[PDB]
């Protein structure tokens, strides 16, 4: 039975119905899921989003995928047999755009254990949305979230929970520029009560700290330097009216163009930031 097993397991034989969830009219389907992030970058303040390539894995028991033929504990399968079995219909509540990867094959992984446990790993780009408070922009610490949520199954048919240990996994050399991803990642529930009932949700908190070294060069030093030469007009003679006035008249506009330059790198936010009350006071 080298290939009839795949037929008698699911598809063309044994009457496997991929439309009916496991253990129908029974307890819900606890889907233990964990995340592995490959890349974590492109964190734009203008768009309030970030792109994070991840491998989304998730296990769930399925009592009608238990086999007694091969003595193997687990059993790797071809991803083409991944469209003929049930799968939890989760999504990302703050998705804002997310696509699969079909580079040379569907980047999918299937593994049906001896008792029915179904591992399921897929790659996703998932340019999530990260509403970030910029009250202290140059030296702020944001928290970009990732909400894994069910859509078509209430919390009587499908329940999600993180891996008990090691749920979020970061690549080794993953170092995004201008930020540093803290090793602590908060895993909490985000259960969504919508108009149509109880819906499963589980999020992962990412704490990011802004590397101040860049803004220390482009923002603070030039405006700091522009304020310094405004002081050396007191050392020049006071009778030199046009020469003395030449300093301030160009430095006033100089700080004005500097303060404007601190905006294109940022969104158009209403309140005042940590750099605005630096550029404004230096303008003063």
């Amino acid at each position, epitope marked *: 039975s080298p290939s009839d097993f795949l037929d008698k397991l699911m598809g063309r034989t044994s009457g496997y119905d991929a439309r009916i969830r496991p253990n129908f*009219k*029974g*307890p819900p389907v606890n889907v233990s899921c964990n995340i592995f992030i490959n890349s974590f970058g492109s964190i734009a303040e203008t768009t309030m989003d970030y792109r994070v390539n991840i491998f989304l894995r998730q296990q769930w028991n399925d009592p009608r995928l238990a086999y007694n033929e091969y003595p193997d504990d687990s059993l790797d399968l071809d991803p083409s047999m991944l469209d003929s079995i049930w799968k939890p219909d989760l999504f990302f509540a703050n998705e804002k755009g997310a696509h699969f990867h079909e580079i040379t094959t569907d980047n999918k992984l299937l593994r049906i254990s001896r008792n029915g446990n179904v591992l399921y790993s897929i790659r996703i780009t998932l340019t999530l949305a990260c509403p970030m408070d910029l009250k202290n922009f140059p030296m702020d610490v944001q928290t970009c979230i990732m909400q894994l949520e069910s859509f078509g199954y209430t*919390m009587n048919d499908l*329940i999600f929970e993180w891996q008990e240990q090691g749920a979020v996994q970061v690549a080794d050399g993953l170092t995004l520029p201008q930020f540093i991803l803290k090793e602590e990642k908060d895993l909490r529930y985000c*259960t969504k*009560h919508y*108009n149509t009932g*109880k819906f499963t949700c589980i999020e992962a908190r990412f704490h990011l700290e802004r590397q101040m070294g860049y803004y220390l060069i482009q923002m603070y030093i030039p405006s700091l330097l522009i304020v310094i030469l405004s002081w050396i007009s007191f050392w020049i003679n006071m009778d030199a009216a046009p020469a003395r006035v030449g300093l301030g008249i160009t430095t006033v506009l100089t700080m004005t163009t500097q303060s404007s330059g601190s905006r294109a790198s940022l969104p158009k936010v209403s309140y005042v930031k940590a750099i605005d009350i630096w550029m404004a006071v230096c303008l003063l």
Partner: antibody, heavy 115, light 103 residues
Framework: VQLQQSGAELMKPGAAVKISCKAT????????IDWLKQRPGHGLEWIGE????????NYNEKFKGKATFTAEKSSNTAYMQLSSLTSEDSAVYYC???????????WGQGTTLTV | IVMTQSHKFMSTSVGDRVSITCKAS??????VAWYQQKPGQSPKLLIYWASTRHTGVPGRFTGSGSGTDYTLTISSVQAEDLSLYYC?????????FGGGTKL
């Protein structure tokens, strides 16, 4: 998350009373607020549910018309109004809130109503 | 859907073991909760989905059963276990409890 109700009530047969359920700990328009009845001599009994943001409700068939669910996001509170009180309305009315299911893991102190 | 605890009262003793039944009518799911109401206070959740525990419930509370029959079970009663125990089915629209059982 801590739900808070109003004090006891003393109403006459035929009047109508409005029991509130203050939501101290979360936005009232976030979770489904439920309403239960516990008449002494009998056990608890689910009245219905309301989502205080979408105006959606689900009344029990036995309590249709008797119970009127409302809400007010101005103070994070969900109201229930019992119309046409009788002698069979003397009980304790709770406002539970199940988050991860249809159970009731959060509760109010209990509004006693004697008609 | 009608739940039914066929014992309003049950005899027991401190430190002993007792099995409380709640024989539903239909085969809803394994969805059955268990509440504890001390006289004068709101009930509290103990076992949701008939086998899982709530954050804070002691270890001596265990749930079991499926289909129609269910059961709550204590192991070592302390001075805070003789109260009312309600079984709740949460696999339907009318969330009907049981008759309650005073321990």
């Amino acid at each position: 998350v801590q739900l808070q109700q109003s004090g006891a009530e003393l109403m006459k047969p035929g009047a109508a009373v409005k029991i509130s359920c203050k939501a101290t700990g979360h936005t009232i328009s976030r979770y489904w607020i439920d309403w239960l009845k516990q008449r002494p001599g009998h056990g608890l009994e689910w009245i219905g549910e309301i989502l205080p943001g979408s105006g959606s409700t689900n009344y029990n068939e036995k309590f249709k018309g008797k119970a009127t669910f409302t809400a007010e996001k101005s103070s994070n509170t969900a109201y229930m109004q019992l119309s046409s009180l009788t002698s069979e309305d003397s009980a304790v009315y709770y406002c539970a809130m199940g988050v991860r299911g249809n159970y009731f893991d959060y509760w109010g102190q209990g509004t006693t109503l004697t008609v | 859907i009608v739940m039914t605890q066929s014992h309003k009262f049950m005899s027991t003793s401190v430190g002993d073991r007792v099995s409380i039944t709640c024989k539903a009518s239909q085969d809803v799911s394994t969805a059955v909760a268990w509440y504890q109401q001390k006289p004068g206070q709101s009930p509290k959740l103990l076992i949701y989905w008939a086998s899982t525990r709530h954050t804070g419930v002691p270890g001596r509370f265990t749930g079991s059963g499926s289909g129609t029959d269910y059961t709550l079970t204590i192991s070592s009663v302390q001075a805070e276990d003789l109260s009312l125990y309600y079984c709740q089915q949460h696999y339907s629209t009318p969330r009907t409890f049981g008759g309650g059982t005073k321990l």
